[PDB]
Design a protein around this ligand. Structure first.
Ligand SMILES: CCCCCCCCCCCCCCCCCC(=O)OC[C@H](CO[C@@H]1O[C@H](CO[C@H]2O[C@H](CO)[C@H](O)[C@H](O)[C@H]2O)[C@H](O)[C@H](O)[C@H]1O)OC(=O)CCCCCCCCCCCCCCCCC
Ligand code: CLA
Ligand code: CLA
Ligand SMILES: CC(C)=CCC/C(C)=C/CC/C(C)=C/CC/C(C)=C/CC/C(C)=C/CC/C(C)=C/CC/C(C)=C/CC/C(C)=C/CC/C(C)=C/CC1=CC(=O)C(C)=C(C)C1=O
Ligand SMILES: CC(C)=CCC/C(C)=C\CC/C(C)=C/CC/C(C)=C/CC/C(C)=C/CC/C(C)=C/CC/C(C)=C/CC/C(C)=C/CC/C(C)=C/CC1=CC(=O)C(C)=C(C)C1=O
Ligand SMILES: CCCCCCCCCCCCCCCCCC(=O)OC[C@H](CO[C@@H]1O[C@H](CO)[C@H](O)[C@H](O)[C@H]1O)OC(=O)CCCCCCCCCCCCCCCCC
Ligand SMILES: CCCCCCCCCCCCCCCCCC(=O)OC[C@H](CO[C@@H]1O[C@H](CO)[C@H](O)[C@H](O)[C@H]1O)OC(=O)CCCCCCCCCCCCCCCCC
Ligand SMILES: CCCCCCCCCCCCCCCCCC(=O)OC[C@H](CO[C@@H]1O[C@H](CO)[C@H](O)[C@H](O)[C@H]1O)OC(=O)CCCCCCCCCCCCCCCCC
Ligand SMILES: CCCCCCCCCCCCCCCC(=O)OC[C@H](COP(=O)(O)OC[C@@H](O)CO)OC(=O)CCCCCCCCCCCCCCC
Ligand SMILES: CCCCCCCCCCCCCCCC(=O)OC[C@H](COP(=O)(O)OC[C@@H](O)CO)OC(=O)CCCCCCCCCCCCCCC
Ligand SMILES: CC1=C(/C=C/C(C)=C/C=C/C(C)=C/C=C/C=C(C)/C=C/C=C(C)/C=C/C2=C(C)CCCC2(C)C)C(C)(C)CCC1
Ligand code: OEX
Ligand SMILES: [Fe+2]
Lengths: 341, 30, 66, 34, 334, 35, 37, 75, 38, 42, 28, 52, 42, 38, 30
């Protein structure tokens, strides 16, 4: 009837890719985060920001290419193309590291626009919105690492660059400087990721091994029409199996599939709380009862004090080349070496 | 004195594992 | 269903429930306010970020009068 | 009309000429440490 | 009638509380001895010379540790790969000094887990099930035997084996990074994709079932009570969750087949952990990951740094600091 | 220490022999199909 | 009136036409592709 | 129209037998004519270091960062 | 007073969800104790 | 030297929430024994 | 029409692969 | 003496009498049912369901 | 200087027996609401 | 298992005896705290 | 630190006195 109704009926039309209202936020912003990454890893260097090479023009393969974080002198500037740093020039915008905030900002509005996509399709199909709530897990890892972690730090420079090996140094930068593995929020996150991979490997292998005979063929994939009301696997058998192997087992398909939602997602929320606590440098660095004892008793050694000496090697050896803006000129005689290494 | 708490948490965790396996609410059809 | 003396005063404030303005109403007036408040938040963030420089506005610890 | 398996054959060996070209330039040109 | 037939009838009975089976004849004595020695060695065990340099590393709770720092320490560098049981130790005090209980726990563990795996086969045979849950459990058995058995073999000592603890795990992972560069190795890459993908398709499948549940309860009681146990009606509209994901990405990327869907949940992690556990295995024999250090040069020939060179300087920090007294010669051959 | 050692080889080849003579005890025929 | 303030309002105008040319194209095509009753 | 009916048709491969080589070679000429080094400012292998500047160039200012990169890219 | 509330309901917790919630607390007690004792 | 407020953190972090979850189970079984009407309802 | 949907993703992809094959033959 | 090349780790003579009486003590149990059966009775199956 | 095991004596001497006596009251009211059959039995 | 026990009974505690037992514990906690802290 | 426990015992005792007076189980004939 009205003008709003014609636009509402056009976006929600059955077509190849469902656009909806949320596609106006997703499809422009996701196309430019992805294309900003493919351009930045192919053409744009890191020679002026980090003093590296992170492009395909500079000989890096898929692994050692990245869209890199800007300089520490930029601080937390948004680095707009028209801004006071770039001033409209495209070429000087790329050399400062403007594509990285271009990827991260238009990417953050892609994950907004993709989670709104999951509320919109669920309302048209008419189902409960648990996909949009389980996808809030990965939103809490993008925001609290690519956004909330460099905000608490000195600049955008201490953020993960969007490249394969550039994530890998961020894994190593976070052990030596922060002792991230000791943090109980990672420990509750590893329990959800390795726990979530566990549940789909079991529920994959128990459904597929309690199937009913619905055909004479040896292939069991053929014997399932999608609109049938009979269940395709014996729940009573699978309960009787695991009650004797493992001792305790699900007797509820509604509780089972909810539990496959809770376990992976909670590991992304609990691990997201800790990385917000490392923006503020509130790290779980030391057990002081272990540290006061190892200072007074020069014979008491645990595995825990062995990890601190591994972190002095990370804090001293890479920090010269890690942070060229700070100009660490270490002598050879201050770098902690071991015996004969 | 400090390690006494850690031991009580560990064997206390193994108690509720014992009760969950053997005193489980046995599911029944009908 | 218990009449109190304070309940008698406030009763016309709750006596309406679910009356609506028919049609689109004041929705286009609201969006012009929401478009305006979106521009307001962008500006005061960029002042704070030093990505929008205003003359005689310096984002630094200033001498408040003692 | 073209048979579909001819299409996946020609495009499939076209990818091998693209991939093995990329593993070629790991040992020559830039990024080869020569 | 015979005594053996009345014993085979009991040991293979599915009417027991826990199925014992013929693999339980060597699962249960193995894993109860790995357990009962682990609880004692984690709580009360004296310090252990791990580096073979007579610098004993404390690992138990009574010697001032906690849950995180306490760990069953691996055996000595002095022993190395030699089999060191209690009777070949001339006292228990000489046994506990040189890293005794690490070999008693690990060898009774790998026998009991490889028997727990065959026990999952056996009950599937006696219950009429198709058999292959135990093939999915091969993936953590591959990974448990990679860090406790295969990596001490190729490195030639159980002292390079994984410490049975929590802080000892991260001593294992970091030293393995400096000496082998696991992150650049494509088999750790193929299993990070296995568990990121595994936790994706777990929470992606578990949401689309819970989204499309059928009304069987009221809003006061729980959602889960609309499933009566052993019912034959399907508890969720699978056509509904197919039409949702058929619009969320596109139409042809959706499994309408629930059997092929529930197979892909078992394929992706298990193949990802088979491949990963043969990353530790091929890096047990010093076939390390990629090494792109000093790979990008200018026309003058000066080394241009990459992200691998920054990653190298993190590896050089752990390499020059791990086992800071055990080395005497310029190259860590072990 | 040579008294403990005797005790272990009893316990090992007790349960190993239950394993070996378990599957020799017509073990494929113990299925829910027939017998 | 500064360099930074003049460039920002120009981006605000440029942010209007990006929303604009998407919106103007979307109204016209929504007329042609209406659904039969 | 179904997707597999498109790519097996001849009229599809009539159009895209011209457009694919005319677009792949334009991606070749975008590099071999040295154009990509000037749009994105990526250093050529000749020009990581210069005769004067022998260190690693870094930006060391918030607001004159455009002017400092005008310095480090002339020589 | 006034009348009885028609919004009275009952709270349930089966034996299954007891062992989840017990094990949830003890494992969080095992995990976070070492940090609190410092 | 350990913090002496951590004993109060852990042992009340165990007992107070774990004794809470016991109560929701005991009143659950009491309502089931309450409706059932035999020998235990009273 | 869906010619704007695919070719916003495929016309760039062939253009960048025209550049990635050219960078294999570039040396110092 | 650990690295001696001795069969099954049998260091002393006493450990043999442990091994022989372990395999045989269960072998004799096994022969109480599956022993003393007809060693000449075949089948054209994949699997035999003969007797106990 | 006070004994640091007295905090554990008092605060568990309060809470553990007092949380016990709450449980016997909650299951008492649940059995009474269990038999009564209206709106709360379930 | 075996059959159900005919000796199942129910436990009662009215609202009156709750406040006795609460006040009994807190007053014993007030009294004996000063000696335990010493 | 020590007197904080004594205060909590005293005002905690005055809570259960408050609930016993006003939330008492009111006795009823018939
Ligand atoms: C949930 C779902 C979310 C959905 C995703 C949405 C994504 C949208 C993207 C958000 C955009 C945020 C980035 C804005 C840039 C930024 O932040 O920019 C940061 C600026 C602050 O600027 C910094 O300010 C600092 C303070 O300096 C001041 O102090 C110094 C010493 O006192 C000197 O005196 C200096 O002169 C003076 O300016 C330093 O100057 C830094 O160099 C300068 O960069 O604030 C600002 O723009 C705004 C900051 C105030 C707003 C606070 C909210 C945002 C920050 C949250 C994080 C808080 C940190 C907690 C860590 C966890
Ligand atoms: C809808 C999709 C969308 C969204 C949400 C964003 C969002 C963003 N872009 Mg982006 N962009 C998009 C599409 C989008 N873009 C497209 C399609 C292109 C290609 C042209 C770009 C190209 C682009 C570049 C090149 C840059 C950004 C940047 C930014 C960021 C800051 C922009 C800013 O401050 O806004 C300011 C604008 C507004 C707040 C708009 C408000 C509009 C008001 C409400 C109405 C204005 C009316 C006006 C006063 C009168 C107009 C009259 C006229 C119509 C007749 C922000 C995260 C910058 C960035 O991230 O830097 C790192 C940056 O440099 N974008
Ligand atoms: C057994 C090993 C193990 C395991 C399982 C984990 C598990 C985890 N670690 Mg950990 N870690 C470990 C060892 C381990 N760690 C060690 C040894 C170290 C070294 C000290 C670290 C250091 C470390 C750090 C430094 C961090 C973690 C983080 C994490 C979390 C992963 C975050 C995640 O899911 O990202 C998944 C990624 C996302 C959710 C991002 C969103 C994904 C978007 C939606 C994808 C969109 C793509 C789209 C389709 C476009 C693609 C197309 C385009 C390419 C063309 C998880 C809890 C992170 C964390 O805690 O974050 C909270 C983190 O920052 N770990
Ligand atoms: C005209 C102008 C101005 C010129 C400019 C040109 C212009 C307009 C350009 C704009 C064009 C533009 C860029 C638009 C393109 C839009 C676009 C695609 C943008 C997004 C960008 C982008 C990077 C997208 C790619 C990422 C993408 C979405 C990847 C999808 C990943 C994928 C295929 C995953 C499949 C995984 C999979 C097999 C899952 C199933 C397994 C699983 C367990 C699911 C659970 C499950 C499934 C079921 O099935 C059912 C049944 C049930 C029960 C169930 O549990
Ligand atoms: C005793 C001694 C000495 C101990 C010392 C040990 C020591 C050194 C320290 C260990 C201490 C310790 C345990 C620390 C853990 C700390 C830590 C990691 C905390 C995690 C806490 C926590 C809140 C984590 C948050 C993330 C989270 C919620 C993870 C949960 C992970 C988890 C519990 C997953 C469940 C996995 C599970 C077993 C599932 C399989 C279920 C299974 C039996 C399937 C059955 C089944 C499957 C089917 O498919 C079908 C069809 C049917 C029918 C069916 O039935
Ligand atoms: C029809 C629509 C098609 C849709 C296209 C959608 C776009 C998405 C495509 C994403 C591709 C991202 C991968 C980039 C790899 C790249 O180009 O490397 C191209 C690089 C370029 O190769 C490098 O070139 C340099 C030139 O100086 C040097 O010579 C290096 O030595 C040489 O390695 O090649 C590699 O690094 C070699 C290995 C390539 C490995 C790629 C596969 C890795 C796994 C990623 C899988 C992504 C899945 C995509 C699925 C689609
Ligand atoms: C029901 C459970 C009841 C128990 C609650 C359990 C919570 C346990 C965790 C809190 C106790 C741990 C504190 C350490 C114990 C210790 O001795 O500290 C003791 C310290 C006090 O410190 C003492 O102070 C004294 C004078 O003040 C003297 O100086 C002593 O030397 C000094 O030790 O207490 C605390 O720090 C208590 C802090 C509790 C408040 C937490 C603030 C942080 C909360 C941030 C919230 C973020 C949450 C986001 C969501 C996640
Ligand atoms: C449920 C409630 C659970 C809590 C129980 C509450 C009981 C509280 C009373 C006991 C705790 C008070 C002890 C003081 C606390 C303190 O720090 O002590 C701490 C002392 C230990 O003392 C510490 O010891 C350490 C090494 O042992 C170091 O030396 C410390 O310096 C030293 O203080 O603990 C006790 O004395 C506990 C004794 C408990 C056993 C009581 C024995 C007497 C019982 C006689 C029974 C007669 C009953 C007849 C009936 C009446
Ligand atoms: C490198 C890429 C990785 C492998 C690529 C292909 C994936 C495996 C596809 C065939 C799987 C074989 C197949 O599809 O079987 C599917 C099988 C059920 O199949 P059916 O019995 O219907 O038929 C399979 C056979 O019986 C013959 O029809 O499902 C399982 O039992 C799952 C339980 C084991 C779960 C773990 C499975 C992991 C095994 C995969 C290792 C296979 C390598 C050999 C490939 C032939
Ligand atoms: C030698 C081998 C013999 C088997 C060994 C036995 C060990 C088995 C462990 C028992 C799990 C008990 C947890 C109770 C859990 C409980 O009782 O759940 C009972 C639950 C049954 O759910 P239903 O379907 O009955 O529930 C339907 C509704 O009523 C939901 O409330 O079973 C599961 O879902 C358990 C599956 C995950 C199993 C979680 C195990 C996590 C591993 C243990 C983590 C703790 C280890 C800590 C050590 C420090
Ligand atoms: C940045 C920027 C921009 C742009 C954007 C865009 C437009 C982009 C796009 C772009 C794109 C979107 C890109 C793409 C790329 C692609 C590629 C280059 C691909 C490749 C591929 C490959 C290499 C792969 C491989 C393979 C195959 C082929 C098969 C088998 C498998 C595999 C995976 C191996 C603008 C203007 C806004 C401005 C601002 C900034
Ligand atoms: O032991 Mn354990 O860690 Ca395998 O590397 Mn050589 O050895 Mn000793 O050093 Mn490094
Ligand atoms: Fe499922």
């Amino acid at each position: 009837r009205g003008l709003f109704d014609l636009v509402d009926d056009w976006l929600k039309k059955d077509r190849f890719v469902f656009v909806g209202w949320s596609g106006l936020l997703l499809f422009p912003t996701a196309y430019l985060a992805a294309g900003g990454w493919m351009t930045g890893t192919t053409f744009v260097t890191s020679w002026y920001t980090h003093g590296l090479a992170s492009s395909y023009l500079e000989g890096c393969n898929f692994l050692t290419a990245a869209v890199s974080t800007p300089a520490n002198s930029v601080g937390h500037s948004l680095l707009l193309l028209w801004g006071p740093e770039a001033q409209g020039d495209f070429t000087r915008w790329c050399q400062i590291g403007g594509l990285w905030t271009f990827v991260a900002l238009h990417g953050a509005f892609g994950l907004i626009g993709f989670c709104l996509r999951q509320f919109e399709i669920a309302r048209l199909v008419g189902i409960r919105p648990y996909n949009a709530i389980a996808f809030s897990g990965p939103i809490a890892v993008f925001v609290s690492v690519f956004l909330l972690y460099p905000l608490g730090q000195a600049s955008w420079f201490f953020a993960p660059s969007f490249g394969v090996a550039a994530i890998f140094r961020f894994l190593l930068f976070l052990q030596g400087f922060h002792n991230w593995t000791l943090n109980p929020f990672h420990m509750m996150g590893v329990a959800g990721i390795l726990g979530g991979a566990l549940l789909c490997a079991i529920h994959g292998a128990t459904v597929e091994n309690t199937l009913f005979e619905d055909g004479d063929a040896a292939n069991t994939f053929r014997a399932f029409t999608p609109t049938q009301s009979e269940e395709t696997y014996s729940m009573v058998t699978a309960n009787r199996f695991w009650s004797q192997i493992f001792g305790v087992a699900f007797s509820n398909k509604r509780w089972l599939h909810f539990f496959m939602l809770f376990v992976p997602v909670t590991g992304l929320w609990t691990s997201s709380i800790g990385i917000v606590g490392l923006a503020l440098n509130l790290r779980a660095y030391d057990f002081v009862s272990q540290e006061l004892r190892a200072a007074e008793d020069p014979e008491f050694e645990t595995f825990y004090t062995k990890n601190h000496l591994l972190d002095e090697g990370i804090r001293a050896w890479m920090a010269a080349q890690d942070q060229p803006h700070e100009n660490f000129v270490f002598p050879e005689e201050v770098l902690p070496r071991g015996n004969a290494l | 004195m400090e390690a006494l708490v850690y031991t009580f948490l560990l064997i206390g965790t193994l108690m509720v594992i014992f009760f969950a396996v053997f005193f489980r609410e046995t599911p029944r059809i009908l | 269903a218990l009449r109190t003396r304070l309940g008698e005063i406030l009763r016309p404030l709750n006596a309406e429930y679910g009356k609506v303005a028919p049609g689109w109403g004041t929705t286009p007036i609201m969006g012009i306010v929401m478009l305006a408040f979106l521009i307001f938040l962008v500006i005061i963030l960029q002042i704070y970020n030093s990505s929008l420089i205003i003359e005689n506005v310096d984002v630094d610890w200033a001498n408040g009068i003692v | 009309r073209i048979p579909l398996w001819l299409v996946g054959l020609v495009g499939g060996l076209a990818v091998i000429t693209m991939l093995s070209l990329f593993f070629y330039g790991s040992y020559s040109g830039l990024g080869s440490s020569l | 009638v015979s005594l053996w037939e009345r014993f085979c009838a009991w040991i293979t009975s599915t009417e027991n509380r826990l199925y014992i089976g013929w693999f339980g004849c060597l699962m249960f004595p193995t894993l109860l001895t790995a357990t009962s020695c682990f609880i004692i060695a984690f709580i009360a065990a004296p310090p252990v010379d791990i580096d073979g340099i007579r610098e004993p590393v404390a690992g138990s709770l009574l010697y001032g540790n906690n849950i995180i720092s306490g760990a069953v320490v691996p055996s000595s560098n002095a022993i190395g790969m030699h089999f060191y049981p209690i009777w070949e130790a001339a006292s228990i005090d000489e046994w506990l000094y040189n890293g005794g209980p690490y070999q008693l726990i690990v060898l009774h563990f790998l026998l009991g887990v490889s028997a727990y795996m065959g026990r999952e086969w056996e009950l599937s045979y006696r219950l009429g099930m198709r058999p292959w849950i135990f093939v999915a459990f091969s993936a953590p058995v591959a990974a448990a035997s990679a860090v406790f058995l295969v990596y001490p073999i190729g490195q030639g000592s159980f002292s390079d084996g994984m410490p049975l603890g929590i802080s000892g795990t991260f001593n294992f992972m970091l030293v393995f990074q400096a000496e082998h560069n696991i992150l650049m190795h494509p088999f750790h890459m193929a299993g990070v994709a296995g568990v990121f993908g595994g936790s994706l398709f777990s929470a992606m499948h578990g949401s689309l079932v819970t989204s499309s549940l059928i009304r069987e309860t009221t809003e006061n009681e729980s959602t889960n009570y609309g499933y009566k146990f052993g019912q034959e009606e399907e508890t969720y509209n699978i056509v509904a969750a197919h039409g949702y994901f058929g619009r969320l990405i596109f139409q042809y990327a959706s499994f309408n087949n629930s059997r092929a869907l529930h197979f892909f949940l078992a394929l992706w992690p298990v193949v990802g952990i088979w491949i990963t556990s043969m990353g530790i295995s091929t890096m047990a024999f010093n076939l390390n990951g990629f090494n792109f250090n000093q790979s990008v040069v200018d026309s003058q020939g000066r080394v241009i740094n990459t992200w691998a060179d920054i990653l190298n300087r993190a590896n050089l920090g752990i390499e020059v600091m791990h086992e800071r007294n055990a080395h005497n010669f310029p190259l860590d051959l072990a | 220490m040579l008294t403990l050692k005797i005790l272990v080889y009893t316990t090992v080849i007790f349960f190993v022999s239950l394993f070996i003579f378990g599957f020799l005890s017509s073990d494929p025929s113990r299925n829910p199909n027939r017998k | 009136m500064t360099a930074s303030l003049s460039n920002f309002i120009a981006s605000l105008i440029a942010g209007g036409v990006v929303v604009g040319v998407i919106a103007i194209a979307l109204i016209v095509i929504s007329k042609s592709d209406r659904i039969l009753r | 129209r179904p997707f597999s009916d498109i790519i097996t048709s001849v009229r599809y491969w009539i159009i895209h037998s011209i457009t694919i080589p005319s677009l792949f070679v334009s991606g070749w000429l975008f590099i071999s004519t040295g154009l990509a080094y000037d749009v994105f400012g990526t250093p050529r292998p000749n020009e990581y270091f210069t005769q004067d500047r022998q260190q690693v160039p870094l930006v060391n200012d918030r607001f004159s960062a455009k002017q400092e990169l005008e310095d480090l890219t002339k020589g | 007073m006034t009348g009885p509330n028609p919004n009275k309901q009952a709270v349930e917790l089966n034996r299954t969800s007891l062992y989840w919630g017990l094990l949830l607390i003890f494992v969080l007690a095992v995990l976070f104790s070492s940090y609190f004792f410092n | 030297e350990v913090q002496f407020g951590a004993y109060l953190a852990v042992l009340l972090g165990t007992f107070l929430p774990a004794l809470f979850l016991v109560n929701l189970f005991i009143q659950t079984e009491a309502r089931k024994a309450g409706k059932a009407g035999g020998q235990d309802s009273d | 029409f869906r010619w704007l949907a695919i070719h916003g993703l495929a016309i760039p992809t062939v253009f960048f692969l025209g550049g990635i094959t050219a960078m294999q033959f570039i040396q110092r | 003496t650990e690295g001696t090349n001795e069969w099954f780790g049998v260091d002393d003579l006493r450990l043999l009498a442990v091994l022989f009486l372990g395999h045989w003590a269960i072998l004799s149990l096994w022969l109480g049912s599956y022993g003393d059966s007809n060693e000449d009775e075949d089948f054209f199956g994949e699997i035999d369901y003969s007797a106990r």
